[PDB]
Design a protein around this ligand. Structure first.
Ligand code: SRL
Length: 287
């Protein structure tokens, strides 16, 4: 069994998740959609083409009336068309990041951290928590993220893109709500995010959540078979941290030739004292 302390830790994370995770995406509205339409710079485009060609999805929008709009992205031709779903993606991700910021704020341990640590933790973990929330609505039989009335369907080769292989693998583990939120807490409270000051306090908080997840697993799962689930999960978090760095770099390359990030993404991801360079995040954190 878990200590009362560990049960309380889980309760608070579960509370936080239920209050901030719009699982049916019923409040995701007013987003943009794809419309009805040099030596060194080429090197930039060529990396960008690679950065994107692997992550293509068609988009489906189910209307309340039973109607269906389906969008199939264009093949990579000359150039620009490759960025067609980016403004919509920016909107979905920004929407997701806002729920991630609210999640963090409801957690006492996060709130007790100095504001500048809260900012640094949110910048380092944002993409990771968003992807962890996305895995819970990912349908691995169809290669589709089911987002309420919206759906994103991936257009042996997939398993080659680290983030796609990550969704498949994570999904296979058949985690409980509790395990997903403990994964989120562990990712959130990473002592080694750049610019974190209270390294020791964050490191200890992270070990607490990891121990709770470890005990949760010992106690809630048939022994022998789930003997290494915790470590499998820790390995997935290590790989996710690396995918985060990789994807942040792609984001910056695309932004360089085709600025498109929302103002909140610009703050989260280092796009153009710590509180002055992060006023949106700061305002979201203090309300
Ligand atoms: C670092 C910021 O990353 P980012 O939030 O930026 C959104 C504009 C981002 C988000 C993202 C990534 C994936 C993959 C990787 C699993 C395919 C998704 O499937 C989805 C949806 C919404 C369709 C579920 C969103 P990116 O990894 O994928 C964009 C297609 O962007 C990388 C630049």
């Amino acid at each position: 069994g878990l200590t009362e302390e560990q049960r309380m830790m889980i309760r608070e994370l579960m509370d936080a998740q239920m209050k901030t995770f719009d699982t049916t995406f019923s409040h995701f509205k007013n987003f943009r959609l794809p419309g009805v339409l040099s030596r060194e710079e080429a090197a930039k485009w060529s990396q960008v083409r690679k950065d994107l060609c692997s992550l293509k999805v068609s988009l489906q929008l189910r209307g309340e009336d039973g109607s269906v709009w389906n969008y199939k992205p264009p093949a990579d031709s000359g150039g620009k068309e490759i960025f067609s779903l980016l403004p919509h993606m920016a909107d979905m991700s920004t929407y997701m990041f806002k729920g991630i910021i609210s999640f963090a704020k409801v957690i006492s341990y996060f709130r007790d951290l100095p504001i500048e640590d809260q900012i640094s933790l949110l910048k380092g973990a944002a993409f990771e928590l968003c992807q962890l929330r996305f895995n819970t609505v990912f349908n691995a039989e169809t290669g589709t993220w089911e987002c309420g009335r919206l759906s994103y369907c991936l257009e042996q080769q997939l398993l080659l893109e680290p983030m796609l292989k990550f969704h498949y693998m994570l999904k296979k583990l058949q985690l409980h709500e509790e395990e997903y939120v403990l994964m989120q807490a562990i990712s959130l409270f990473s002592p080694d995010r750049p610019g974190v000051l209270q390294h020791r306090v964050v490191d200890q908080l992270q070990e607490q959540f990891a121990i709770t997840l470890k005990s949760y697993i010992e106690c809630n799962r048939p022994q022998p078979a789930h003997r290494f689930l915790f470590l499998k999960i820790m390995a997935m978090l290590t790989e996710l941290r690396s995918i985060n760095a990789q994807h942040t770099q792609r984001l910056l390359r695309i932004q360089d030739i085709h600025p498109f990030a929302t103002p909140l993404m610009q703050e989260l991801f280092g796009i153009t004292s710590l509180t002055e360079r992060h006023k949106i995040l700061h305002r979201l954190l203090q309300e």
